[PDB]
Amino acid sequence: LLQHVKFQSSNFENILTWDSTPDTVYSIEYKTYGERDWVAKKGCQRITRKSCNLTVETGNLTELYYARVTAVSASATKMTDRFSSLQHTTLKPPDVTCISKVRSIQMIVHPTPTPIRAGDGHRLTLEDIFHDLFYHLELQVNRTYQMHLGGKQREYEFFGLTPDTEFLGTIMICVPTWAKESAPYMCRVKTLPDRTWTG
Ligand X SMILES: *[C@@H]1O[C@H](CO)[C@@H](O)[C@H](O)[C@H]1NC(C)=O
Ligand Y SMILES: *[C@@H]1O[C@H](CO)[C@@H](O[C@@H]2O[C@H](CO)[C@@H](O)[C@H](O)[C@H]2NC(C)=O)[C@H](O)[C@H]1NC(C)=O
Question: Residues in the site for ligand X, rule: CB under 6 A?
Answer: 60, 62-63, 119
d(CA 176, CA 194): 40
Interface with other proteins in residues 145-184 (CB under 8 A): 145-148, 159-160, 176-179
Report how far Cα 189 is from the mean position of its chain's Cα atoms. 25
Beta bridge partners of 66: 31
d(CA 190, CA 186): 13
Give yes or no for residue 118 binding ligand Y (CB under 6 A): no
Interface with ligand Y in residues 88-117 (CB under 6 A): 113-115
Residue from 1, 39, 56, 183 binding ligand Y (CB under 6 A): 56
d(CA 169, CA 29): 44
Partner from ligand X, ligand Y, other proteins, none binding residue 53, C-beta < 5-8 Å depending on class? ligand Y
d(CA 57, CA 180): 23
Shortest distance, position 24 Cβ to other proteins, whole Å: 25
The single-letter code of the amino acid at 27 is S
Work out the end-to-end distance of the chain between its first and last CA atoms, rounded to an integer number of angstroms.
71
Partner from other proteins, ligand X, ligand Y, none binding residue 140, C-beta < 5-8 Å depending on class? none
Shortest distance, position 82 Cβ to other proteins, whole Å: 4
d(CA 118, CA 27): 30
Partner from ligand X, ligand Y, other proteins, none binding residue 22, C-beta < 5-8 Å depending on class? none
User: What does the binding site for other proteins look like in residue numbers (CB under 8 A)?
Assistant: 31, 33-36, 62, 64, 66, 81-82, 84, 86-87, 131-132, 136, 141-142, 144-148, 159-160, 176-179
